CSV table of N, CA and C and ligand atoms in Angstrom, one decimal:
chain,number,residue,atom,x,y,z
A,47,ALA,N,112.6,84.4,123.1
A,47,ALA,CA,112.6,82.9,123.2
A,47,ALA,C,111.7,82.2,122.2
A,48,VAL,N,111.9,80.9,122.0
A,48,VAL,CA,111.0,80.1,121.2
A,48,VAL,C,110.8,78.7,121.8
A,49,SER,N,109.6,78.2,121.7
A,49,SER,CA,109.4,76.8,122.0
A,49,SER,C,108.3,76.2,121.1
A,50,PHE,N,108.4,74.8,121.0
A,50,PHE,CA,107.5,74.1,120.1
A,50,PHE,C,106.2,73.7,120.8
A,51,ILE,N,105.0,74.1,120.3
A,51,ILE,CA,103.8,73.8,121.0
A,51,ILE,C,102.8,72.9,120.2
A,52,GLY,N,103.0,72.8,118.9
A,52,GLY,CA,102.1,72.0,118.1
A,52,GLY,C,102.3,70.6,118.1
A,53,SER,N,101.9,69.9,117.0
A,53,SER,CA,102.0,68.4,116.9
A,53,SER,C,103.0,68.1,115.7
A,54,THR,N,103.8,67.0,115.9
A,54,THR,CA,104.8,66.6,114.9
A,54,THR,C,104.1,66.1,113.7
A,55,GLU,N,103.1,65.2,113.9
A,55,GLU,CA,102.4,64.5,112.8
A,55,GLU,C,101.0,65.1,112.7
A,56,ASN,N,100.6,65.4,111.5
A,56,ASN,CA,99.3,66.1,111.3
A,56,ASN,C,98.6,65.6,110.1
A,57,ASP,N,97.3,65.3,110.2
A,57,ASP,CA,96.5,64.8,109.1
A,57,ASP,C,95.8,66.0,108.4
A,58,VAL,N,95.7,65.9,107.1
A,58,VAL,CA,95.1,66.9,106.2
A,58,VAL,C,93.8,66.4,105.6
A,59,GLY,N,92.7,67.0,106.0
A,59,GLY,CA,91.3,66.6,105.5
A,59,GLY,C,90.7,65.6,106.4
A,60,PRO,N,89.3,65.5,106.4
A,60,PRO,CA,88.6,64.4,107.1
A,60,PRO,C,88.9,63.0,106.6
A,61,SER,N,89.0,62.0,107.5
A,61,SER,CA,89.2,60.7,107.1
A,61,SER,C,88.0,60.1,106.3
A,62,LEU,N,88.4,59.5,105.1
A,62,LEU,CA,87.4,59.0,104.2
A,62,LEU,C,86.3,60.0,103.8
A,63,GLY,N,86.7,61.3,103.7
A,63,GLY,CA,85.8,62.3,103.2
A,63,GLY,C,85.5,62.0,101.7
A,64,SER,N,84.3,62.4,101.3
A,64,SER,CA,84.0,62.2,99.9
A,64,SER,C,83.6,63.6,99.2
A,65,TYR,N,84.0,63.7,98.0
A,65,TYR,CA,83.9,65.0,97.3
A,65,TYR,C,83.3,64.8,95.8
A,66,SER,N,82.5,65.7,95.4
A,66,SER,CA,81.8,65.7,94.1
A,66,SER,C,82.1,66.9,93.3
A,67,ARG,N,81.7,66.9,92.0
A,67,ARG,CA,81.7,68.1,91.1
A,67,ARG,C,81.5,67.6,89.6
A,68,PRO,N,93.0,68.6,82.6
A,68,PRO,CA,92.9,68.1,84.0
A,68,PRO,C,91.7,68.7,84.7
A,69,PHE,N,91.0,68.0,85.5
A,69,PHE,CA,89.8,68.5,86.2
A,69,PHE,C,90.1,68.8,87.6
A,70,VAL,N,89.9,70.1,88.0
A,70,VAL,CA,90.1,70.5,89.4
A,70,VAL,C,88.9,70.6,90.2
A,71,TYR,N,88.8,69.9,91.3
A,71,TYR,CA,87.7,70.0,92.3
A,71,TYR,C,87.7,71.2,93.2
A,72,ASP,N,86.6,71.8,93.3
A,72,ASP,CA,86.3,73.0,94.3
A,72,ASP,C,86.1,72.4,95.7
A,73,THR,N,87.2,72.1,96.4
A,73,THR,CA,87.0,71.6,97.7
A,73,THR,C,87.3,72.6,98.8
A,74,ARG,N,87.7,73.8,98.3
A,74,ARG,CA,88.0,74.9,99.2
A,74,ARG,C,89.0,74.6,100.3
A,75,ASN,N,88.6,74.7,101.6
A,75,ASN,CA,89.6,74.5,102.7
A,75,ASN,C,89.3,73.1,103.4
A,76,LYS,N,88.4,72.4,102.8
A,76,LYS,CA,88.0,71.1,103.4
A,76,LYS,C,89.1,70.1,103.5
A,77,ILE,N,90.0,70.0,102.5
A,77,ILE,CA,91.2,69.1,102.6
A,77,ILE,C,92.3,70.0,103.0
A,78,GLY,N,92.3,70.3,104.3
A,78,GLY,CA,93.3,71.2,104.9
A,78,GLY,C,93.7,70.8,106.3
A,79,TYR,N,94.8,71.5,106.8
A,79,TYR,CA,95.2,71.5,108.2
A,79,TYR,C,95.6,72.9,108.5
A,80,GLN,N,95.0,73.5,109.6
A,80,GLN,CA,95.4,74.8,110.1
A,80,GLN,C,95.6,74.8,111.6
A,81,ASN,N,96.6,75.5,112.1
A,81,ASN,CA,96.9,75.6,113.5
A,81,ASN,C,97.6,77.0,113.7
A,82,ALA,N,96.9,77.9,114.4
A,82,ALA,CA,97.5,79.2,114.7
A,82,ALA,C,98.7,79.1,115.8
A,83,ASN,N,98.8,78.0,116.5
A,83,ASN,CA,99.7,77.9,117.6
A,83,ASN,C,100.7,76.7,117.5
A,84,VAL,N,101.8,76.9,116.7
A,84,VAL,CA,102.7,75.8,116.5
A,84,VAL,C,104.0,76.0,117.2
A,85,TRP,N,104.5,77.3,117.3
A,85,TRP,CA,105.6,77.7,118.1
A,85,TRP,C,105.2,78.9,119.0
A,86,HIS,N,105.6,78.9,120.2
A,86,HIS,CA,105.5,80.1,121.1
A,86,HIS,C,106.7,80.9,120.9
A,87,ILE,N,106.5,82.2,120.6
A,87,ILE,CA,107.6,83.1,120.4
A,87,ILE,C,107.5,84.4,121.3
A,88,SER,N,108.6,85.0,121.6
A,88,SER,CA,108.6,86.1,122.5
A,88,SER,C,109.8,87.0,122.4
A,89,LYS,N,109.7,88.3,122.9
A,89,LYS,CA,110.8,89.2,123.0
A,89,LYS,C,111.7,89.3,121.8
A,90,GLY,N,111.2,89.8,120.7
A,90,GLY,CA,112.0,90.1,119.5
A,90,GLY,C,112.2,89.0,118.5
A,91,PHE,N,111.8,87.8,118.8
A,91,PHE,CA,112.1,86.7,117.9
A,91,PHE,C,111.5,86.9,116.6
A,92,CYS,N,112.3,86.7,115.5
A,92,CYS,CA,111.8,86.9,114.1
A,92,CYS,C,111.8,85.6,113.4
A,93,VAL,N,110.6,85.3,112.8
A,93,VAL,CA,110.4,83.9,112.2
A,93,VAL,C,109.5,83.9,111.0
A,94,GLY,N,109.9,83.1,110.0
A,94,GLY,CA,109.1,82.8,108.8
A,94,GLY,C,109.0,81.2,108.7
A,95,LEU,N,108.5,80.8,107.5
A,95,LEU,CA,108.3,79.3,107.3
A,95,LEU,C,108.8,78.9,105.9
A,96,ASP,N,109.4,77.7,105.9
A,96,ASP,CA,109.7,77.0,104.6
A,96,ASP,C,108.8,75.8,104.5
A,97,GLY,N,108.4,75.4,103.3
A,97,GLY,CA,107.6,74.3,103.1
A,97,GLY,C,108.3,73.3,102.1
A,98,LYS,N,108.0,72.0,102.2
A,98,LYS,CA,108.6,71.1,101.2
A,98,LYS,C,107.6,69.9,100.9
A,99,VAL,N,107.4,69.7,99.6
A,99,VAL,CA,106.5,68.6,99.2
A,99,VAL,C,107.3,67.4,98.7
A,100,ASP,N,107.0,66.2,99.2
A,100,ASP,CA,107.7,65.0,98.9
A,100,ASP,C,107.2,64.2,97.8
A,101,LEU,N,105.9,64.5,97.5
A,101,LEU,CA,105.2,63.7,96.4
A,101,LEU,C,105.9,64.0,95.0
A,102,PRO,N,105.8,63.0,94.1
A,102,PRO,CA,106.3,63.2,92.7
A,102,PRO,C,105.6,64.3,91.9
A,103,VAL,N,106.3,65.1,91.2
A,103,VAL,CA,105.7,66.1,90.3
A,103,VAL,C,105.3,65.4,89.0
A,104,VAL,N,104.0,65.5,88.6
A,104,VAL,CA,103.5,64.8,87.4
A,104,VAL,C,103.0,65.7,86.4
A,105,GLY,N,103.0,67.0,86.7
A,105,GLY,CA,102.4,68.0,85.7
A,105,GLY,C,102.5,69.4,86.3
A,106,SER,N,101.9,70.3,85.6
A,106,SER,CA,101.8,71.7,86.2
A,106,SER,C,100.6,72.4,85.6
A,107,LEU,N,100.1,73.4,86.4
A,107,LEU,CA,98.9,74.2,86.0
A,107,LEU,C,99.1,75.6,86.5
A,108,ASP,N,99.1,76.5,85.5
A,108,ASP,CA,99.2,78.0,85.8
A,108,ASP,C,100.4,78.3,86.8
A,109,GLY,N,101.5,77.6,86.6
A,109,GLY,CA,102.7,77.9,87.3
A,109,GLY,C,103.0,77.2,88.6
A,110,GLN,N,102.1,76.2,89.0
A,110,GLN,CA,102.4,75.4,90.2
A,110,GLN,C,102.3,73.9,89.8
A,111,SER,N,102.9,73.1,90.7
A,111,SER,CA,103.0,71.7,90.3
A,111,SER,C,101.7,71.0,90.5
A,112,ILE,N,101.4,70.0,89.7
A,112,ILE,CA,100.4,68.9,90.0
A,112,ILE,C,101.2,67.7,90.6
A,113,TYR,N,100.9,67.3,91.8
A,113,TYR,CA,101.6,66.3,92.4
A,113,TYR,C,100.8,65.0,92.3
A,114,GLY,N,101.5,63.9,92.1
A,114,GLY,CA,100.8,62.6,91.8
A,114,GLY,C,100.5,61.8,93.0
A,115,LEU,N,99.3,61.2,92.9
A,115,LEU,CA,98.9,60.2,94.0
A,115,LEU,C,98.7,58.8,93.4
A,116,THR,N,97.9,58.7,92.3
A,116,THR,CA,97.7,57.5,91.6
A,116,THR,C,97.7,58.0,90.1
A,117,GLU,N,97.3,57.1,89.2
A,117,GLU,CA,97.4,57.5,87.8
A,117,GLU,C,96.2,58.3,87.4
A,118,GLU,N,95.1,58.2,88.1
A,118,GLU,CA,93.9,59.0,87.9
A,118,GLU,C,93.9,60.3,88.6
A,119,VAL,N,94.6,60.4,89.8
A,119,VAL,CA,94.4,61.5,90.7
A,119,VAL,C,95.7,62.2,91.1
A,120,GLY,N,95.7,63.5,91.1
A,120,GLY,CA,96.8,64.3,91.6
A,120,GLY,C,96.3,65.5,92.5
A,121,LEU,N,97.2,66.3,92.9
A,121,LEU,CA,96.9,67.4,93.9
A,121,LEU,C,97.5,68.8,93.5
A,122,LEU,N,96.8,69.9,93.7
A,122,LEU,CA,97.4,71.2,93.8
A,122,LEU,C,97.6,71.4,95.3
A,123,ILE,N,98.8,72.0,95.7
A,123,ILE,CA,99.1,72.1,97.1
A,123,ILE,C,99.5,73.6,97.5
A,124,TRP,N,99.0,74.1,98.6
A,124,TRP,CA,99.5,75.4,99.2
A,124,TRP,C,100.0,75.2,100.6
A,125,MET,N,101.1,75.9,100.9
A,125,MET,CA,101.6,75.9,102.3
A,125,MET,C,101.8,77.3,102.7
A,126,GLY,N,101.7,77.7,104.0
A,126,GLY,CA,101.9,79.0,104.4
A,126,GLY,C,101.6,79.3,105.9
A,127,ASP,N,101.4,80.6,106.1
A,127,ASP,CA,101.0,81.1,107.4
A,127,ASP,C,99.6,80.6,107.8
A,128,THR,N,99.2,80.8,109.0
A,128,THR,CA,98.0,80.3,109.5
A,128,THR,C,96.7,80.5,108.7
A,129,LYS,N,96.5,81.7,108.2
A,129,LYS,CA,95.2,82.0,107.5
A,129,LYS,C,95.3,81.4,106.1
A,130,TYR,N,94.3,80.7,105.6
A,130,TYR,CA,94.4,80.0,104.4
A,130,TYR,C,94.6,80.8,103.1
A,131,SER,N,94.2,82.1,103.1
A,131,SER,CA,94.3,83.0,102.0
A,131,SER,C,95.8,83.4,101.8
A,132,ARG,N,96.6,83.2,102.8
A,132,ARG,CA,98.1,83.4,102.7
A,132,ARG,C,98.9,82.3,102.2
A,133,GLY,N,98.2,81.2,101.8
A,133,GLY,CA,98.9,80.0,101.2
A,133,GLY,C,99.8,80.3,100.0
A,134,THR,N,101.0,79.7,100.0
A,134,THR,CA,101.9,79.8,98.8
A,134,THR,C,101.7,78.5,98.0
A,135,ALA,N,101.4,78.7,96.7
A,135,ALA,CA,101.3,77.5,95.8
A,135,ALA,C,102.7,76.8,95.7
A,136,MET,N,102.7,75.5,95.8
A,136,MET,CA,103.9,74.7,95.8
A,136,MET,C,104.3,74.2,94.5
A,137,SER,N,105.6,74.2,94.2
A,137,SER,CA,106.2,73.6,93.0
A,137,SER,C,107.5,72.9,93.3
A,138,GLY,N,107.7,71.8,92.6
A,138,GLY,CA,108.9,70.9,92.8
A,138,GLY,C,109.0,70.3,94.2
A,139,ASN,N,110.2,69.8,94.6
A,139,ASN,CA,110.4,69.0,95.8
A,139,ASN,C,111.5,69.6,96.7
A,140,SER,N,111.8,70.8,96.6
A,140,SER,CA,112.8,71.5,97.4
A,140,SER,C,112.2,72.3,98.5
A,141,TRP,N,113.0,72.7,99.5
A,141,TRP,CA,112.5,73.6,100.6
A,141,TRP,C,112.2,74.9,99.9
A,142,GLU,N,111.0,75.5,100.1
A,142,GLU,CA,110.6,76.8,99.5
A,142,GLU,C,110.1,77.8,100.6
A,143,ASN,N,110.4,79.1,100.5
A,143,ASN,CA,109.9,80.1,101.4
A,143,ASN,C,108.4,80.2,101.2
A,144,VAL,N,107.6,79.9,102.2
A,144,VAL,CA,106.1,79.9,102.0
A,144,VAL,C,105.5,81.0,102.9
A,145,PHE,N,106.3,81.6,103.8
A,145,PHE,CA,105.9,82.8,104.6
A,145,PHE,C,107.1,83.6,104.9
A,146,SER,N,107.1,84.9,104.3
A,146,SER,CA,108.2,85.8,104.5
A,146,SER,C,108.6,86.1,105.9
A,147,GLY,N,107.6,86.1,106.8
A,147,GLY,CA,107.9,86.2,108.3
A,147,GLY,C,107.5,87.5,109.0
A,148,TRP,N,107.6,87.4,110.3
A,148,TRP,CA,107.4,88.6,111.1
A,148,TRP,C,108.2,88.6,112.4
A,149,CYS,N,108.2,89.6,113.2
A,149,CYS,CA,108.9,89.7,114.4
A,149,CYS,C,108.0,90.1,115.5
A,150,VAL,N,107.9,89.3,116.6
A,150,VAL,CA,107.1,89.6,117.8
A,150,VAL,C,107.8,90.8,118.5
A,151,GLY,N,107.0,91.5,119.3
A,151,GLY,CA,107.6,92.7,120.0
A,151,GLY,C,108.7,92.3,121.0
A,152,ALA,N,109.5,93.3,121.3
A,152,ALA,CA,110.6,93.2,122.2
A,152,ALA,C,110.1,92.8,123.6
A,153,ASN,N,108.9,93.1,123.9
A,153,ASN,CA,108.3,92.9,125.2
A,153,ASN,C,107.1,92.0,125.3
A,154,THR,N,106.8,91.3,124.2
A,154,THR,CA,105.5,90.6,124.1
A,154,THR,C,105.7,89.1,123.8
A,155,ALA,N,104.7,88.4,124.0
A,155,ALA,CA,104.7,87.0,123.6
A,155,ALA,C,103.5,86.8,122.6
A,156,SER,N,103.7,85.9,121.7
A,156,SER,CA,102.7,85.5,120.8
A,156,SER,C,103.0,84.1,120.3
A,157,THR,N,102.4,83.7,119.1
A,157,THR,CA,102.6,82.4,118.5
A,157,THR,C,102.8,82.5,117.0
A,158,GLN,N,103.4,81.5,116.4
A,158,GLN,CA,103.6,81.3,114.9
A,158,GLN,C,102.8,80.1,114.6
A,159,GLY,N,101.9,80.2,113.5
A,159,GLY,CA,101.1,79.0,113.1
A,159,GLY,C,101.4,78.7,111.7
A,160,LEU,N,100.5,77.9,111.1
A,160,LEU,CA,100.7,77.5,109.7
A,160,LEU,C,99.4,76.9,109.1
A,161,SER,N,99.5,76.7,107.8
A,161,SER,CA,98.4,76.0,107.1
A,161,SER,C,98.9,75.3,105.9
A,162,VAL,N,98.2,74.1,105.6
A,162,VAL,CA,98.4,73.3,104.4
A,162,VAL,C,97.0,73.0,103.8
A,163,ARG,N,96.9,73.2,102.5
A,163,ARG,CA,95.7,73.0,101.9
A,163,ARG,C,95.9,72.4,100.5
A,164,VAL,N,95.1,71.5,100.1
A,164,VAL,CA,95.2,70.8,98.8
A,164,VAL,C,93.9,70.7,98.0
A,165,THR,N,93.9,70.7,96.7
A,165,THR,CA,92.7,70.4,96.0
A,165,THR,C,92.9,69.3,95.0
A,166,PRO,N,92.0,68.3,95.0
A,166,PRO,CA,92.2,67.1,94.1
A,166,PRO,C,92.0,67.5,92.6
A,167,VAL,N,92.7,66.7,91.8
A,167,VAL,CA,92.7,66.9,90.3
A,167,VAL,C,92.6,65.5,89.6
A,168,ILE,N,91.7,65.4,88.7
A,168,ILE,CA,91.6,64.1,87.9
A,168,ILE,C,92.5,64.3,86.7
A,169,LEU,N,93.5,63.4,86.7
A,169,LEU,CA,94.5,63.4,85.6
A,169,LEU,C,94.1,62.6,84.4
A,170,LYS,N,93.5,61.5,84.7
A,170,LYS,CA,92.9,60.7,83.6
A,170,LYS,C,91.6,60.0,84.1
A,171,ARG,N,90.5,60.3,83.4
A,171,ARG,CA,89.2,59.8,83.7
A,171,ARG,C,89.1,58.3,83.5
A,172,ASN,N,88.5,57.6,84.4
A,172,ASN,CA,88.4,56.1,84.4
A,172,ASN,C,87.1,55.7,83.8
A,173,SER,N,86.7,54.5,84.0
A,173,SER,CA,85.4,54.0,83.7
A,173,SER,C,84.5,53.9,85.0
A,174,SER,N,85.2,53.6,86.1
A,174,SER,CA,84.5,53.6,87.5
A,174,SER,C,83.9,54.9,87.9
A,175,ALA,N,84.4,56.0,87.4
A,175,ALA,CA,83.9,57.4,87.8
A,175,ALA,C,83.8,57.6,89.4
A,176,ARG,N,84.4,56.7,90.1
A,176,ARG,CA,84.7,57.0,91.6
A,176,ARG,C,86.2,56.7,91.7
A,177,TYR,N,86.9,57.4,92.5
A,177,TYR,CA,88.3,57.3,92.7
A,177,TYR,C,88.7,57.4,94.1
A,178,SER,N,89.4,56.4,94.6
A,178,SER,CA,89.9,56.4,96.0
A,178,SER,C,91.3,56.7,96.1
A,179,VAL,N,91.7,57.3,97.2
A,179,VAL,CA,93.1,57.6,97.5
A,179,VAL,C,93.3,57.2,98.9
A,180,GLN,N,94.5,56.5,99.2
A,180,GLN,CA,94.8,56.1,100.6
A,180,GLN,C,95.7,57.2,101.3
A,181,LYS,N,95.8,57.0,102.6
A,181,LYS,CA,96.7,57.9,103.4
A,181,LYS,C,98.1,57.9,102.9
A,182,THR,N,98.6,59.1,102.6
A,182,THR,CA,99.9,59.3,101.9
A,182,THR,C,100.6,60.5,102.5
A,183,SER,N,101.9,60.4,102.7
A,183,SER,CA,102.6,61.6,103.2
A,183,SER,C,102.7,62.6,102.1
A,184,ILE,N,102.5,63.9,102.5
A,184,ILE,CA,102.6,65.0,101.6
A,184,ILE,C,104.0,65.7,101.7
A,185,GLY,N,104.5,66.0,102.9
A,185,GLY,CA,105.8,66.7,103.0
A,185,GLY,C,105.8,67.3,104.4
A,186,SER,N,106.5,68.5,104.5
A,186,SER,CA,106.8,69.1,105.8
A,186,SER,C,106.9,70.6,105.7
A,187,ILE,N,106.8,71.2,106.9
A,187,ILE,CA,107.0,72.7,107.1
A,187,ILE,C,108.0,72.9,108.3
A,188,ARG,N,109.0,73.8,108.1
A,188,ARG,CA,109.9,74.1,109.1
A,188,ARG,C,109.8,75.6,109.4
A,189,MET,N,110.0,76.1,110.6
A,189,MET,CA,110.2,77.5,110.9
A,189,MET,C,111.5,77.9,110.5
A,190,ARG,N,111.6,79.2,110.1
A,190,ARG,CA,112.9,79.8,109.7
A,190,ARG,C,113.1,81.1,110.5
A,191,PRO,N,113.9,81.0,111.6
A,191,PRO,CA,114.3,82.2,112.4
A,191,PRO,C,115.1,83.1,111.4
A,192,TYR,N,115.0,84.4,111.7
A,192,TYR,CA,115.8,85.4,111.0
A,192,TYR,C,116.3,86.5,111.9
A,193,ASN,N,117.0,87.5,111.3
A,193,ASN,CA,117.4,88.7,112.0
A,193,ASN,C,118.4,88.3,113.2
A,194,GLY,N,119.0,87.1,113.0
A,194,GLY,CA,119.9,86.6,114.1
A,194,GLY,C,119.3,85.8,115.2
A,195,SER,N,117.9,85.6,115.1
A,195,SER,CA,117.3,84.7,116.0
A,195,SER,C,117.8,83.2,115.8
A,196,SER,N,117.7,82.4,116.9
A,196,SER,CA,118.1,81.1,116.8
A,196,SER,C,117.1,80.1,117.4
A,197,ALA,N,117.0,79.0,116.7
A,197,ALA,CA,116.1,77.9,117.2
A,197,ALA,C,116.7,77.1,118.3
A,198,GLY,N,118.0,77.3,118.6
A,198,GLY,CA,118.6,76.5,119.7
A,198,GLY,C,118.5,75.0,119.4
A,199,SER,N,118.0,74.2,120.3
A,199,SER,CA,117.6,72.8,119.9
A,199,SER,C,116.1,72.6,119.9
A,200,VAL,N,115.4,73.7,119.8
A,200,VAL,CA,113.9,73.6,119.6
A,200,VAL,C,113.6,72.9,118.3
A,201,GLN,N,112.6,72.0,118.4
A,201,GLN,CA,112.1,71.3,117.2
A,201,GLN,C,111.7,72.3,116.1
A,202,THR,N,112.2,72.1,114.9
A,202,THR,CA,111.9,73.1,113.9
A,202,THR,C,110.9,72.6,112.9
A,203,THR,N,110.7,71.3,112.8
A,203,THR,CA,109.9,70.7,111.7
A,203,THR,C,108.7,69.9,112.1
A,204,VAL,N,107.6,70.0,111.3
A,204,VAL,CA,106.4,69.2,111.4
A,204,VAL,C,106.0,68.6,110.1
A,205,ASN,N,105.3,67.5,110.1
A,205,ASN,CA,105.0,66.7,108.9
A,205,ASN,C,103.5,66.6,108.7
A,206,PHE,N,103.1,66.4,107.4
A,206,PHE,CA,101.7,66.3,107.0
A,206,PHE,C,101.4,65.0,106.2
A,207,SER,N,100.3,64.4,106.5
A,207,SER,CA,99.8,63.3,105.8
A,207,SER,C,98.4,63.5,105.3
A,208,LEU,N,98.2,63.2,104.0
A,208,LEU,CA,96.8,63.3,103.5
A,208,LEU,C,96.0,62.2,104.0
A,209,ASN,N,94.8,62.5,104.6
A,209,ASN,CA,93.8,61.5,105.0
A,209,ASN,C,93.2,60.8,103.7
A,210,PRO,N,92.8,59.6,103.8
A,210,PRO,CA,92.3,59.0,102.6
A,210,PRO,C,91.0,59.7,102.2
A,211,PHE,N,90.6,59.7,100.9
A,211,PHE,CA,89.4,60.4,100.5
A,211,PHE,C,88.8,59.7,99.2
A,212,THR,N,87.6,60.0,98.9
A,212,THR,CA,87.0,59.5,97.7
A,212,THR,C,86.5,60.6,96.8
A,213,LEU,N,86.7,60.6,95.5
A,213,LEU,CA,86.2,61.4,94.5
A,213,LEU,C,85.1,60.8,93.7
A,214,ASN,N,84.0,61.5,93.6
A,214,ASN,CA,82.8,61.0,92.7
A,214,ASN,C,82.7,61.8,91.4
B,456,LEC,C1,96.6,84.3,116.4
B,456,LEC,C2,97.8,83.9,117.2
B,456,LEC,O1,97.6,83.5,118.4
B,456,LEC,N1,99.0,83.9,116.6
B,456,LEC,C3,99.2,84.4,115.2
B,456,LEC,C4,99.9,85.8,115.2
B,456,LEC,O2,98.9,86.7,115.6
B,456,LEC,C5,99.3,88.0,115.9
B,456,LEC,C6,98.7,88.6,117.1
B,456,LEC,C7,99.1,89.9,117.4
B,456,LEC,C8,100.0,90.6,116.6
B,456,LEC,N2,100.3,91.9,117.0
B,456,LEC,O3,101.3,92.6,116.4
B,456,LEC,O4,99.6,92.5,118.1
B,456,LEC,C9,100.5,90.0,115.5
B,456,LEC,C10,100.2,88.7,115.2
B,456,LEC,O5,100.4,86.2,113.9
B,456,LEC,C11,101.3,85.1,113.3
B,456,LEC,C12,101.8,85.7,111.9
B,456,LEC,O6,100.8,86.1,111.1
B,456,LEC,C13,100.5,83.8,113.1
B,456,LEC,O7,101.4,82.8,112.5
B,456,LEC,C14,99.9,83.3,114.4
B,456,LEC,O8,99.1,82.2,114.2
């Protein structure tokens, strides 16, 4: 079996967080969303995750996209399984496999979770040397059943919004 237990709409990072330091900020996991329990799965269900970024691609760095927010500021983005170190670096605007997946035991119950993580990038330095960003939609993640498993009419997709932040 499978059922949806998480939230449909999800905020990434603390509201009006401020960060100091193309220039890439070391924000670690601060601008993130993580939830180990988004679908409940049981009895042989096999599942992975696809991710999709809806932001415009404005550049690239070491093989992944820089996604644009304003003219000063963009983002590097990772999506994946629950633990942050399993994040897949995102490129383009198509659905991408961001977790190869696993299968719960034939006689057990568990959960499937996810994570989204971003790091701010200064694309063009201003004169203000402080930069604000407002609440913006990032994209989505859907579960991907496999091995013949079926979602039935269970909700497959959840969405992410970047909370506003300031760069110093
Ligand atoms: C920790 C938890 O409640 N569920 C996690 C789940 O944790 C597991 C707990 C037990 C086993 N097990 O084989 O005994 C496997 C994963 O693993 C999934 C895939 O990595 C995660 O998406 C999910 O968040």
